């Protein structure tokens, strides 16, 4: 057949990936969990509280798969959104850098992300295995 | 001759100036022109600017 | 007998030390504005003024107020070396007197005069 990541829907892909990590609990935790705003502009903290990081780390991994090499500053700009800066028009500014950096640092040691040339972070050989296994698992859930 | 006869004028509106006379208001600094907006309409086609649309 | 009122100061313990801690020790114990300002080079800022304030207390007539050290430089912060002497703040219409105290610490000279005549 043709087992790839694109057959599985993008929103439904992360649900199987999140539960996969919480069984092991070996993706590592930084220390800033639930002492967190999430972005530079966001009144309420995370509603999920527990889990949470495993949803974030899964969505970072799948975006590193599709593209050549993703960085810290771009991920902050991608996740980040609108504000409410008093009685002015709503602007756009980057999200939390410390959360998205320790995703990339921790996933290196677990065995997903690799150090690429020029600049950014590409995928390892063993990283492509775990992405496809969960994609194959999600294919079994649908079919 | 006297000691104090200047201010740190490396920025702002006072230091910057046009080429013709030296007006400190309505200064075009785009593309390093330094010609104020009254005289730019006079010398538009000589430089090469035209009102196409 | 020991405590008369309370310590007049910045943030924490006691007054006594402030009289003998010139500028560098005072800058450590301060907010973001004074630290960032004093980190940069102060040339002819505490050079001309402090020679008068110290010399005025030598010329003073014992226990009474020293002479008034008039100031155009009203951007200066009240460091604790000259707690006792008077300073003349320039609005435009005459150098207005301001008596320095250990209460009035961590503030500018200009705010104890005001340049508009109503209120």
């Amino acid at each position: 057949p043709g087992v790839s990541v694109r057959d599985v829907p993008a929103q439904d892909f992360i649900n199987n990936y999140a539960s996969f990590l919480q069984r092991q609990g070996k993706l590592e935790v930084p220390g800033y969990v639930d002492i967190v705003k999430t972005s530079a502009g966001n009144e309420l903290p995370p509603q999920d509280s527990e889990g949470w990081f495993y949803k974030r780390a899964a969505s970072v991994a799948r975006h590193i798969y599709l593209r050549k090499q993703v960085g810290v500053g771009k991920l902050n700009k991608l996740y980040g959104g609108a504000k409410n800066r008093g009685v002015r028009p709503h602007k756009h500014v980057d999200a939390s850098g410390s959360i998205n950096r320790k995703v990339l640092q921790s996933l290196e040691k677990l065995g997903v992300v690799e150090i690429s040339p020029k600049g950014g972070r590409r995928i390892s050989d063993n990283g492509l295995r775990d992405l496809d296994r969960i994609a194959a698992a999600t294919l079994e859930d649908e079919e | 001759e006297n000691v104090w006869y200047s201010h740190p004028r490396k920025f702002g509106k006072g230091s910057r100036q046009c080429r013709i006379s030296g007006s400190h208001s309505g200064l075009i600094r785009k593309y390093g022109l330094n010609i104020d907006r009254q005289s730019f309409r006079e010398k538009a086609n000589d430089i090469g600017f035209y009102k196409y649309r | 007998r020991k405590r008369s009122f309370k310590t007049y100061s910045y943030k924490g313990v006691d007054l006594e030390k402030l009289l003998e801690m010139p500028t560098e020790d005072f800058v450590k114990l301060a907010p973001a504005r004074v630290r960032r300002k004093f980190a940069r080079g102060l040339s002819e800022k505490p050079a001309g003024l402090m020679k008068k304030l110290r010399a005025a207390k030598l010329s003073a007539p014992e226990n009474e107020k020293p002479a008034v050290v008039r100031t155009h430089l009203r951007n200066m912060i009240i460091v604790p070396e000259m707690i006792g002497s008077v300073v003349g703040v320039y609005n435009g219409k005459v150098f207005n007197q301001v008596e320095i105290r250990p209460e009035m610490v961590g503030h500018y000279l200009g705010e104890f005069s005001i340049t508009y005549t109503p209120v």
């Binding site: 002492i35 | - | 924490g12 313990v13 006691d14 209460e103």
Partner: protein, 138 residues
């Protein structure tokens, strides 16, 4: 059900039902993101109404309200910091806070500064143009 409605906490009112955070916001000092930070230490559901609680949770919270640096807070989610000569930080979250600000406002009036002079008359302090704003005054 219906276990207690007011329900005091450091003299101020904490209304029954509603929620954990939004009932605690009634205190003159606690807000919409501090009570969540305080609830995180004790670990209680925001889903619940919160007026109907166990007795130990109220007393555990009040200890965290009084003492900042002892319990798990970074020490930069505090209301007030730095007072007197050379030393430490502390805050308050009750009728202590409203009384503290009145005493702290007197410090500005005693030293007599550009703010303290403006607070006497009831005019705008933060460099605004008063050619429009607030046509009523107090």
């Amino acid at each position: 059900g219906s276990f207690q409605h007011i329900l005091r906490l450091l003299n101020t009112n904490v209304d029954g039902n509603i929620n954990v955070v939004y009932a605690l916001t009634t205190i003159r000092g606690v807000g919409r993101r501090y009570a969540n930070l305080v609830c995180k230490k004790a670990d209680v559901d925001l889903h619940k109404r919160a007026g109907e609680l166990t007795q130990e949770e109220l007393e555990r919270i009040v200890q965290i309200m009084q003492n900042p640096t002892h319990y798990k807070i970074p020490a930069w989610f505090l209301n007030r910091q730095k007072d007197v000569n050379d030393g430490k930080d502390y805050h308050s979250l009750a009728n202590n806070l409203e009384s503290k600000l009145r005493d702290d406002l007197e410090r500005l009036k005693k030293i007599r500064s550009h703010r303290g002079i403006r607070h006497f008359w009831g005019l705008r302090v933060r460099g605004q143009h008063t050619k429009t704003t607030g046509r009523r005054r107090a």
